[PDB]
Structure formats: C-alpha cells, structure tokens
Design a protein around this nucleic acid. Structure first.
Ligand code: SF4
Lengths: 45, 258, 157, 61, 202, 117, 231, 159
DNA sequence: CCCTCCCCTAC
C-alpha cells in the first residue's frame, strides 16, 4: 500500500476519545528511598 | 646560512658556524629561538613575523609557560684547574655546595653540571643564586629570573644578527546562578585534569619497561621517577604543583555559591 | 592568418630588447641581474622608523603595504591628486579582493589536513644499598648486585 | 668515549640512551632503589630493580 | 543603536553569505558542515564553510560592510559566471534606514530564523548549478561616500585601527548599476533591525 | 474546529516560514494528541495548493518509531499499529527548532509530585 | 509524554527517567564557554519541557563537564537555564535529582546500582594476551558479570579511580549486591541474569542514544527490560 | 576637463602596458619591480620594468600616442608569436572633474588586473609585442571610462 | 670602561 492509503486507513478512523485534557492521567509514583536516608557512599569532598 | 651542496638539492641545509645554535655555552631555548628567527628571516624575509614570534616567546617566558628544561645551562667544570675560589664559574659553586653535604657527589674531570638562575634582591651576583634542577624543582617559592634570562641570554645574539640588518631587538621586548565564569573555571580545571591523567598514563606506559606490570604499584613505581633528562618529568611536577594549589576555586563555592 | 589589424593601421618601432638580451643589458647598465627581496615589514604598524642606522651604516627597510608603497611616477615625478574628493550621492561600489578558487578548496579538502680478528668485551654494573640517599660510599656501603653482560657478537668459542 | 665521539649536553646513561638508541629509561634515586631492594613483599619492586640494572648493563654494549 | 546590532547583523550576514555559497554550489558541499557555533551563536543549523582562507575573507568582508553601514542602504551578493563575466543571479539585501541609531535576543533570532527559512525555501527551487568555474561577487550601494581617496596623504599608520580603516577604504572600486525576474522574500521586522530581502535571476 | 487550525497552519507555514508540528497545534488549540493528528490529516486533505513536504512517522509493533523518507518501500506494513503526520515542512531539510513551552493545561499525563514553590 | 504512542494506559507506567551520562559531546582540548552553554541550554529546554510530565534523574558521564575520575559528583546547580530555578530550590527533588556517577537507586525496594560505564570502557582499552582458550556484546557482558563476581566495581584502579577515593573504607569494594546492575554508554545492548551464590543479579548494557537511539524500559515487578528504537 | 584626463591617461596607459608585458611572457619576470609602486591606490601589486631604456621607450610611445590623440580612434597592443608571425592576442583600447576620471581609470585598471590574472601561463622566449595605432576569435568585454567626453572601450581577443 | 679568568668553536 502507498503512503496515502496508510494515512487514509489510520487517521480517518481516529478515536479522539479519552482525551479530556481536564483530568489528565496521573503518572505512576516511583520513589527514591535513598534521597534523604544517610551516607551516600560515592559523595566525596 | 642555507647551503646548497648540489643543484639537484631542493631543501637547503641550515649550516651554522660559531653562533649560539651550535655552542653548548647557553640553554636549549635560545638555540631553538635563534634558529627559528634565522629560518624566518631567510625564508620569508619578513621582519613582522619575527617580531610577533619574539614577542610571543618573551610573553611566555614572562608569564611562566616554559618547559623549565630548556633553561638549563651545561658547562664543563675543571674543579681543580681554577686560579682561586672567587674566579670559579657558576657550576663550581653548585658542585661545592653539593660536595659539602655529600663529598661523594664530586664530578669527574670536565663534567657537565647543569644549573638554573632564579630571582634575587638588589645586587645578588649570578654566582649567588645558581640553583640546580634538583634544588629548583623542590623549592617552595622559586621562579626563574625572567628578566635576566630574557635580556642577557636572548637580546645580545639577536641584536648582533639583526643589527647586521638594521633593526634593534631590545625595543621589541620593552613593549547561586552563574554560568559564564563558573563554566570557564570548570573548563580550565577539566583541561588541567585531563592533561595530568595523560601525563600519568604516559609515565605508567614508560615504566612498563622495568615492572612488566599494569595494575597498581606500577603507578606507584612510576611516581618516583625523577629523571631530569625527560621533558615529561618537568611537566609532571608542574601539573602536580597546579593541582595541589588554587583550592579557593575548587570548593563548594566556585563562583556559583553552591 | 591571425588577428587582423583593421582598415587603417600603423606600427611603432621595434623595442630594443628581447627576452634574452634584457637581463644582459640590465646588468651592463649598472643594475643587478636579479633584485632579491630585502628584509621588509609586512605590517606597516611595526615599521616605527626602525632602519635608522647602525654603526654609521644607513639601512633602508620599508613595507609592502599599500600605505607605504609610492605611486607610479610618469617622467620622474610622482603623479598624485591634490584636490579634495567630490562625493556624489547614490553611488555603487565593488569589492576588489578576489575570493578563493573552487579548485583550491577541493585540493585543500582532498589532502585531509672463520678466524678471530676482534676483541672480546665484558661489561659490569653494581648496585649498593644506601642510607637515605647518600650516594653510596665504598667504605661504609657494600655491594649487592654485580650484573654483567658479555658481547656475544665478537665472542668466540 | 661518548663525550669524545658525539656532542650532546648531559652525557648521562639516560641522555645517551635517548640520543643514540632512542630509548627513554626511567630514573630512580638511590634511596628509592634501596627501598625497593629491601621490600620483603612486592615482587614487582625486585623485578623492577633487577630489570633496571640489567637494562643499564645491556645498553652499555 | 550600535550596542548589540553589530553582533546580530554580523551573524545574519555570515549565515546569509554561507547559505548563498552553499545552495548555489559556489564551493564544494563537502567543505560545508551544519553547525550552530562559528564564534557566534547562530539562529539555526546553518551550513558554514570551514576553509581557513574563505572564513577570513567572509569575516573581513562583513566587518567592512558593518563599518560602512552608516552610509550603505543596499548589499548584494552577485553570482557571476566565469566563462563570461555576467551576473546570472543577484541576491539583494535592502537596508532602508535600517532603523539605526537615533532587545530580547530570542526575538531577533526568531526573525532571523524566519528570514533564513524564506531564503532557503527560495534557493531550494532553483536548478542545480554545476561546479567548475561558477563564482560570486559582492556589490554595495552607498548613500554618500567616496572610497579609494584616503591614500593621497601617505597616511603614516600608528595602530591597527588606522591600518584597517586604510585597507577598508582602499578595498573597493567604483562600478555602475532584459529578462530580469525579481522575487521578494521575508525580511526582519524587529524594532531596531528593519531589513528587507530581494532576489534576481535570469 | 478545522477553521482556526487551518489558519494557524497556513500562517506558520507561509507568513512565518517555519516547520509546524502537531504538538504546536496541541499547545495552540488546547486539544489532545489524537485530535491534533486528525486536524493535521484534515489539513493534509483539501490541498489543491500543495507547497509543503509532509513528514510522516509510523509506530510499528515491538515499540518502534520510524520517520518515513522514501514513501515507497515501507517495511513491515502489517506490523504498523499507527501512522500519522508529524509535521509540515516547507523546506527540504527538516531541522526544526525547539523553545520553551509553558505546558500549564495542555498536559495529558502529570507526574505524581507537584512543584513546590 | 504520551503524544506519540497515545496508549496512556501503558505510557503512564513509566514512573521515572534516568539519563545515565554523556549528555553533551565536546573536547575540552579546544572548547569555550559559549558552545557548551548552547548545548546546555538545549538540554535545559528538554528538561523544562519534559519535567511537568515525568521525573528525571540526571547522572554525569565520561565526556560531560564533570570530573574525569569515576566517582563524579553531581553536575552543578548551575550549567542549566534560569527557567529551571524552581526545581533547584531544594524542596523539589523527587521530580529532578542530580545524582553522583555511581549510585544505588532504591526504586520502591528494587535496589539498582547504576554506573555511567567508565569501568568497563577502561577495562576494554587493554589488550590482554590471554583468554584465548573480540569486542562483542557477550564479552562485555562477561566482563560485567566478572566485575559483579569479584565484588569490585573498578578492577583497573589507576585508570578509573582518583587520589583519595576514601580512607580505610573504599566505596568501590561492594558491600551489598544490587538487584539490577546497569553499565551504560556501551556500543551494543544486552541483558543477562547471573546466579552468584544463590543470588540473582540482572545486568543491563545500555547503548548510546546518539547512534542507535534505543530506550530501555525496565519493569520493577518482574525485572524485564524491553527496548524502544527511534529512527 | 582636458587637464587631468591627460595625466591620468598617461599613468593609466603606463600601468596598462606594464601589466600586459608582465602578466604574459613578453619580458621575463625578476625584471620588474613587483613590490614598490602602486598604480591607482589599488590593493594589488603593480609591476614596473627596471631597465631605464624600456621605461623611457614606453613613456615616449605614450607621449607620441597622446600627442595625436585626436586622430587615433583605437590603440591596440598585439602579442606576436615568434617563428609563426601570428598575432595570438590583441588587447584593444578604443579611442570634467579630477575625481571622476580618477575613479573611472581605477575601475578600468582593476578590471584589467582581474582579467589578466586568470589567464593560462605562457612558456618562455616565444612572444614579442607590437603596438598598433588605428588612424575564430574569443572576445571579452572589460570595464571602460564613460564619464569623460573621451569615452574609451576596453576589450581583448585570443587565438 | 679596561683588565683577567673562563668557556669552546673554527682553521
Ligand atoms: S617521566 Fe620520563 S622517565 Fe619518568 S616515566 Fe614518564 S617518561 Fe619514563
């Protein structure tokens, strides 16, 4: 298939759903437990 | 002058006689400087390029960007064939000052004992400073006498060579948020650190001839090389002096306050 | 034949010199056959009237810049303009310096800038332990290594 | 012999080796060689001093 | 105001000359490399030549034009053929009062970006020019000045500024001003720099 | 709206000559990414005066992203899960420019933490 | 940010971003503050545009404006545009964290030890006339496995380490095995799980993004690394 | 007027003849003064012959041409190839303020320099020159003076 | 502002 046929197949059937933009999806929380504990071994003066 | 021993010879031969480029009565720096100036005069006939080169060299010597090896004299010392003690040359003073601490450090007949010149107070005859490379590289506050070196080892021969042309060389010598300065300091520090690491790698590769090792204790064995006949040693001690100093810039406040 | 002269044309007298006799007549007139380059300043700022004299010898050192070069004279007298210029409005001008050649840039880029008749030889070296860098003395320091080497090229048997 | 034959500056073993044979030899003080030759450990140091003097003896030829 | 305009105009002229020399095959395309720093932060990834002589030539030309700026109201890079000296292409850069002496550099670089994009879009449509004796030239149109008449006093130089003034006054010669095809482009409408663009073909 | 978007694209393509991305439409019209792709495709249609070079990218399976250059030999057309228009380029060399964007309300995914000032 | 893939159900599972070094490429032999500042402003634009959507953990590299030794300190609070002054105020560290060159991120309990990749790149600059009985991905994976086996991150101390790394307690001598061992700035990409004394360490070789711009997505529920190529 | 045009035409013709003599191989190099004089405040180097006889001959030719300038309408300098007697090239010059004529002659001489410095080199001892007074051809049009009432055209031929 | 003493280079 040509490039125009791919665009006609994909973009014409666009869903345009779930894109509220007012209540965006919150990213999953991943924490760094070594942020404040103590003694970073590789931190030199 | 440039010699052409045959018409087929394309590149000339720099044939010098008697001038400071063949006499061992000076320093290796003056030989290179004089040869470069003479080649610039013979090839381009340009007095502006020679002047720019000479001013650049004088500025480098005045600042302290020299190799510190090309400023080492070497004269044969006849330690017994001298008339008296006050007529002894510059090398004999160093030789006797070394003998007084170790009588076994007496040179052979017609030995080439090197020495350098440093700064002094009013007066301070040339014989009075006369530091050897060992004394100069271990001294805390010792800097080469840039005035004496430049003038009395560069200006007379160039004056002769260029007064045969009609120009005086002595007149050419008398003439929380911060991203710019902090980044410039970082560039300087990183350049110096990379140069130091390159010198250390070169010394570690050179020390492979004896140790046949590559891991630790090879850098330790190579760190004790005091070969005064190698240009990498003087650069190594200069890099060490630079890295062990300027602690005010290398802190938590490098003009960035954090 | 070749390039024609025109309908009505004349010819001037033949020049006195040719391609070969030119230098031979230039030397006989009191001039060097080839006038090599004297020491000169490429920068007219560095002139500073340096060639003044030395030991009663007057030297003439000049520059090749446009500021120091004298105009072409016609008849022994230099022809120069004395009156002030008359600038006219709405003029056009052209850069005189020639740009580099196409071929020069390409050439710069392509370069990408059965009988024994000799003497046997033996060598010896010594290592002695010293005491805090004292250049070991042959009266208080003893020998520890007598590494020796024999020249195998000239050694027979 | 080297002083009479070739005209160089220092006339030491390292300088002559570099100017005639194009070989750069490290140089250790008499105290460093003593500390290496008295090291009960660090076979590398003993090999170092041995090869040091062996090369000094081989370059004389 | 001569404070910051002298740097932005220099960058614009550098990118202009380099783009004209690149997209017209005046020099081999291998000697060009897309970059953003040529001793000045460029507004785009402009193909700048890396020849030692050509860089100095372009820099001296731009400095001369910027020195004469107060009287120059038009600057043209003429593309002349080499088999015969004839202007086949001419890219005019108008300087109508330039809003000169009588500012959020990002906006200046945005305007320069628009102008250079227009110039590139225009140059990409012209037919391919063969190498091997295609060359260029430089012509300016001044308001009121007379060049070449500063060497009538022997002008003993004292520093580099006076020598530069002399060699810049002496580097220009006089000149004079069918099926011409003029194509206007997008200029710079920023406050201090009001520049206009043009083009000529055939 | 297909009216403000067309005018904005025409302006940023012809008056202020610059390559326009679909994220620019996202930031200017405050719309989602899919709606921006739909508007870009709609502007790619009705293009009797075509004076630009469309930049088409397609997402294959196994999470691969490619920018189509030849537009004649698209590898593995069966594994394509999406294929949209990325930008409209008036010139030949794409080479866009990226500046500071204030994504105050045009975000579809926010990080779990909030900026503490 | 979820603009290209449009699968917000799966893109919202990428909790953090970890740049493992080599953010700017230059030569300190011939460089000034201008072009380095241009590259740093480009990087700062990227950071300011991506931070409102995802958290970033920046790590120094081998050719970045930082120390040439292996324990490289964080870059600086400077070297970034003034638009990022709100993230460097001290309280906003969970969204942006300039970190030391070696570091053990405790990502929800998954202790991952990350290195920019100078140790392996310094081991590979040697030619050992052994191991016969060549610069392949399996060879570098074996080198990383041996680094984990010997419990020494930097076997070539004179090349990677610097004077005074520590006193009487060296940090490169491993005192605890991590779960994931990351060595970045490698020519090829490859993963390998090794069993050392009843334990299991997953080694990951992250390739450069300049050439072969792949992005590794490492899961934390099963430790499965998948790649995302960008052309 | 007729005052400044005379002197400036003298200087222009002297530089013209000397350039045509030096940039070809009519007379050998190292026989000219290439680093001493300037022609019309132009940045290029102008060569002037060193032999006083040839300079005086050129000056007398220029004075004799200017003495009868009202009758001549073309002053050409032909390049004759020896042993063939065929004019290879023929540089031709066809026929009120001091500044205007100065700038016109400056531009004309600059055009002559730019045209001469891009020609193929010539082997030695094969060319004699001959000036003519008019009282397959490759043509090239050069810049001329149009301000003064003595408008001159400058063009060259080859082969 | 001339002397001796020292260095070492050139035929
Ligand atoms: S300094 Fe000279 S001698 Fe000492 S190690 Fe480095 S190279 Fe070998």
């Amino acid at each position: 298939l040509h490039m125009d046929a791919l665009l006609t197949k994909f973009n014409e059937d666009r869903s345009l759903q779930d894109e509220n933009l007012s209540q965006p999806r919150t990213r999953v929380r991943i924490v760094d437990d070594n942020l404040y504990n103590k003694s970073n071994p590789f931190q030199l003066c | 002058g440039f010699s052409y021993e045959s018409p087929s010879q394309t590149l000339p031969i720099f044939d010098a006689k008697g001038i400071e480029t063949v006499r061992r009565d000076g320093i290796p720096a003056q030989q290179k400087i004089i040869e470069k100036c003479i080649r610039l005069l013979f090839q381009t006939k340009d007095l502006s390029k020679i002047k720019k080169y000479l001013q650049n060299e004088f500025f480098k010597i005045q600042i302290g960007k020299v190799s510190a090896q090309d400023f080492c004299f070497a004269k044969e010392v006849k330690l017994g064939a001298y008339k008296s003690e006050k007529t002894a040359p510059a090398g004999a003073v160093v030789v006797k000052r070394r003998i007084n601490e170790d009588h076994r450090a007496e040179p052979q007949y017609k030995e080439r004992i090197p020495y350098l010149v440093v700064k002094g107070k009013q007066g301070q005859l040339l014989r009075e400073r006369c530091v050897s490379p060992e004394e100069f590289l271990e001294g805390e506050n010792l800097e080469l006498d840039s005035e004496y070196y430049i003038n009395k080892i560069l200006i007379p021969p160039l004056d002769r060579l260029f007064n045969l042309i009609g120009i005086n060389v002595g007149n050419w010598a008398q003439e929380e948020k911060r991203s710019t300065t902090t980044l410039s300091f970082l560039i300087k520090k990183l350049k110096r650190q990379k140069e130091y690491q390159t010198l250390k790698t070169v010394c570690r590769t050179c020390s492979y001839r004896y140790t046949s090792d590559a891991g630790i204790e090879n850098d330790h064995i190579a760190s004790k090389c005091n070969s005064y006949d190698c240009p990498v040693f003087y650069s190594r001690v200069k890099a060490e002096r630079y890295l062990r100093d300027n602690q005010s810039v290398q802190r938590e406040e490098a003009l960035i306050s954090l | 034949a070749g390039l024609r002269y025109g309908k009505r044309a004349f010819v001037y007298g033949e020049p006195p010199f040719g391609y070969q006799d030119i230098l031979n007549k230039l030397e006989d007139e009191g001039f060097p056959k080839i006038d090599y380059k004297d020491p000169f300043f490429s920068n007219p700022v560095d002139l500073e009237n340096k060639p003044y004299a030395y030991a009663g010898k007057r030297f003439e050192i000049s520059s090749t810049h446009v500021s120091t070069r004298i105009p072409v004279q016609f008849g022994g007298e230099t022809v120069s303009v004395y009156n002030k210029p008359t600038f006219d409005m709405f003029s056009s001008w052209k850069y005189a310096l020639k740009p580099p050649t196409y071929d020069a840039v390409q050439k710069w880029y392509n370069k990408v800038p059965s009988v024994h008749d000799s003497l046997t030889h033996l060598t010896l070296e010594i290592h002695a332990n010293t005491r805090s860098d004292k250049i070991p003395d042959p009266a208080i320091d003893e020998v520890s290594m007598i590494i020796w080497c024999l020249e195998e090229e000239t050694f027979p048997l | 012999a080297l002083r009479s034959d070739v005209n160089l500056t220092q006339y030491t073993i390292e300088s002559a080796a570099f100017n005639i044979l194009h070989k750069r030899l490290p140089h250790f003080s008499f105290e460093s060689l003593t500390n290496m030759w008295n090291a009960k450990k660090s076979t590398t140091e003993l090999k170092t001093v041995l090869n040091y003097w062996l090369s000094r003896a081989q370059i004389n030829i | 105001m001569n404070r910051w305009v002298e740097k932005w105009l220099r960058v614009y002229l550098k990118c202009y000359i380099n783009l004209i020399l690149f997209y017209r095959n005046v020099y081999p395309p291998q000697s060009f490399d897309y970059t953003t720093y040529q001793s000045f932060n460029l507004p785009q990834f402009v193909p700048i030549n890396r020849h030692p002589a050509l860089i100095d030539y372009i820099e001296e030309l731009i400095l001369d034009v910027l020195s004469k700026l107060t009287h120059v109201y038009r600057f043209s890079i003429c593309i002349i053929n080499k088999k015969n000296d004839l202007c086949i292409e001419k890219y005019v850069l108008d300087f109508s009062e330039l809003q000169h002496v009588d500012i959020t550099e990002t906006e200046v670089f945005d305007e320069f970006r628009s102008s250079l994009n227009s110039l590139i879009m225009h140059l990409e449509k012209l037919p391919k020019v063969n190498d091997d004796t295609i060359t260029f030239e430089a012509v300016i149109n001044a308001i009121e000045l007379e060049l070449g008449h500063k060497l009538d006093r022997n002008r003993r130089v004292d520093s580099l500024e006076e020598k530069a003034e002399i060699e810049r006054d002496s580097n220009w010669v006089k000149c004079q001003e069918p099926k011409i095809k003029l194509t206007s482009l997008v200029g710079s409408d920023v406050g201090p720099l009001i520049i206009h663009q043009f083009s000529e073909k055939l | 709206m297909d009216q403000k978007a067309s005018y904005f694209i025409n302006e940023k393509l012809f008056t202020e000559v610059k390559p326009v991305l679909f994220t620019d439409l996202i930031h200017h019209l405050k719309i989602g990414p899919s709606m921006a792709k739909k508007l870009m495709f709609d502007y790619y249609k009705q293009t009797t005066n075509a004076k630009y070079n469309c930049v088409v990218i397609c997402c294959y399976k196994d999470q691969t992203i490619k920018i189509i250059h030849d537009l004649s030999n698209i590898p593995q057309q069966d594994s394509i899960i999406d294929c949209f228009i990325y930008a409209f380029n008036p010139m030949d060399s794409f080479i866009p420019y990226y500046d500071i964007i204030d994504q105050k309300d045009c975000l579809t995914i926010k990080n779990s933490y909030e900026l503490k000032v | 940010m979820g603009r290209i893939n449009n699968k917000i159900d799966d893109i919202s599972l990428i909790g953090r971003l970890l740049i493992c070094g080599n953010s700017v490429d230059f030569d300190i032999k011939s460089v000034n503050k201008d072009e380095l500042m241009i590259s740093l402003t480009e990087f700062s634009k990227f950071l300011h545009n991506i931070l409102p959507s995802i958290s970033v953990d920046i790590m120094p590299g081998t050719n970045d404006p930082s120390d040439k030794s292996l324990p490289q300190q964080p870059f600086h609070k400077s070297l970034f545009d003034k638009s990022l002054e709100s993230y460097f105020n001290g309280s906003n560290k969970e969204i942006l964290n300039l970190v030391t060159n070696p570091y053990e991120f405790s990502y929800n309990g998954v202790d991952v030890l990350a290195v920019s990749g100078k140790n392996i790149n310094d081991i590979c600059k040697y030619v050992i006339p052994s191991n016969d009985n060549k610069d392949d991905i399996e060879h570098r994976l074996d080198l990383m496995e041996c680094t984990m086996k010997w419990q020494n991150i930097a076997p070539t101390a004179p090349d990677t380490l610097w004077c005074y790394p520590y006193t009487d307690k060296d940090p490169f001598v491993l005192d605890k095995w991590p779960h994931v061992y990351i060595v970045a700035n490698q020519p090829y990409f490859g993963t390998r799980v090794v069993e050392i004394g009843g334990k299991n360490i997953k080694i990951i070789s992250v390739p450069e993004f300049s050439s072969t711009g792949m992005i590794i997505l490492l899961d934390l529920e099963t430790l499965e690394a998948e790649t995302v190529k960008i052309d």
